[model samples]
Target: MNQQGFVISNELRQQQSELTSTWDLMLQTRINLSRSAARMMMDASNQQSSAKTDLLQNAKTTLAQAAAHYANFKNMTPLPAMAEASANVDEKYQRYQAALAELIQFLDNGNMDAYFAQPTQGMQNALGEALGNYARVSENLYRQTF
Candidate 1:
């Protein structure tokens, strides 16, 4: 058993490597997608909700897979910093999701232009902070474990 309380057979290890690679790809993709969406929103252009959601959901799926892989390790010292960073990331993600949901609802209820008329400073800042925390946690974990 590993730190996360599971066995990582040789085959499982190989699969885990693949999952990590996929996760990295998804993370980068999500970042690019976010930037693109932000630019579009700024100009009152197409929202591209489906594309944005697809990228973010893919990122979430990859992250879940990576966490599952980590769960296979045993007897590992817990990293409180990573945990704290993760909490920040989680909070930011929730804030981002809420803001997006509200924007979508506004668009559905009436006019997209009017709904997104004002700047979304709060949501943007929250999302940025969350991504920053996630990067910090990921870097710290790599330094500790790898």
Candidate 2:
């Protein structure tokens, strides 16, 4: 130990910070997966077919880009020598991914739902699940002070 009995090596500290920041940015890109959908879903009931389809299409793109960002995060988040993706982070993400897939499938056919004035319940529920779980993953996966 150093004389201070504390102080991580600069390299290790760098990776830890990198991991946290990357994770946050990753989180941001995925944040609005339901934002556009729920908004469009709400008022699309009376639109012409083309317009309703366009709205649903835009929301599907939102979901697509969101998941792509997550994939990049999975592949790219820097890990300090001490971390292991925190165990459940990836697990939670996988199930979330599954939910998103189904959500996308819903959106794929969502124009009909829009014309029929369906609730945005599926999109709402999936995002609700993610907000509660994915964001709660522990910081600094290894739980180390330094």
Candidate 3:
């Protein structure tokens, strides 16, 4: 019985570790999208308008890919004990998505003042925080297996 339990625990740990890789990919895509959007804004500021549309399109694609990956990650059932941690990561991701949407909306409307406002900055910070939260949870889960 002890051996069986240990095997199950080890399997759970391995699965969680694999899920972390999926989460990391999602985060990377999101980060890339955010950077692309920022660059688009900066380019607009510099009056280099030629590529703004293309950059926005690229960012949109990246966001869509990230969202899809996140959905898939959520579908992977983690051990019951890890549910809360998984949910927290998902919550943070949802927050990040909301913030990203807000940023995109402001940029789309050419509302520079709104984009640079405190609320917008708060959204950006939340996105960054989400990444950290995800990393922490995944690391903790990986360590718990030992």
Candidate 4:
């Protein structure tokens, strides 16, 4: 029984580490997406070039990379607790992904109308809420593990 408990502890520790890594990437990507969206909005408001152009472009690239890494987390074998936390937040993750995808499409098409519209605001709000939930879940897991 003690051996079994030890095994479970090790597994939980591993899952904790994995989840923490995933959470970090998720937070990073969410921040990048927000920054890029804000910059895009500013650019759409006026034809004038601004410092955010390069910053926005870099954020886009980094967000894509972060999103890809976080996407892979879904396929990993997770402990039951971690899996449940992931399931709870999975819809939020999907929503955030969809919003980012739409934002990328808008950037590609130069759709200032869509970029400046209510949908963009909705996406931003959803992304913010999702990130908040994700952070909470991650923190809870960290506390449980530690």
Q: Specify the highest-lDDT model's number.
A: 3
Q: Write the per-residue lDDT of candidate 3 for residues 34-61, one digit (tens) a residue.
A: 5544666444576644234555566556
Rate residue 18 of model 2 by lDDT: 40
Which candidate, 1 or 2, would have the higher lDDT against the true structure? Answer: 1
Tens digit of per-residue lDDT, candidate 1, span 4-118: 5234234334433543443354345446434434545544445554344454444444445544543442123224554565455445545544444454344334344555554
In order of appearance, the predictions have TM-scores of 0.42, 0.42, 0.59, 0.54
| TM-score of model 2 (CA atoms) | 0.42
Candidate 2 per-residue C-alpha lDDT over 72-122 given as tens digits, one digit per residue, 9 for 90 to 100: 455643345323432344554455445544544554455435333433345
A best-first ranking of the candidates according to their lDDT comes to 3, 4, 1, 2
lDDT tens readout by residue for model 4, 55-113:
44664665666556555666755555555566755666576556656655665455645
- lDDT of candidates 1 onward, in order: 0.47, 0.45, 0.58, 0.56
Give the least accurate 10-residue stretch of model 2, judged by summed lDDT. Answer: 133-142
- The reply for model 1, stretches above 4 Å from the true place, is 1-79, 112-114
C-alpha lDDT (0 to 100) for residue 128 of candidate 4:
59
TM-score of 1: 0.42
Candidate 4: the clashing residue pairs are none
Better of 1 and 3 by lDDT: 3
- Residue 84 in model 3: lDDT: 71
Q: Where does candidate 3 clash, by residue pair?
A: none
User: Which is better, 3 or 4, measured by TM-score?
Assistant: 3
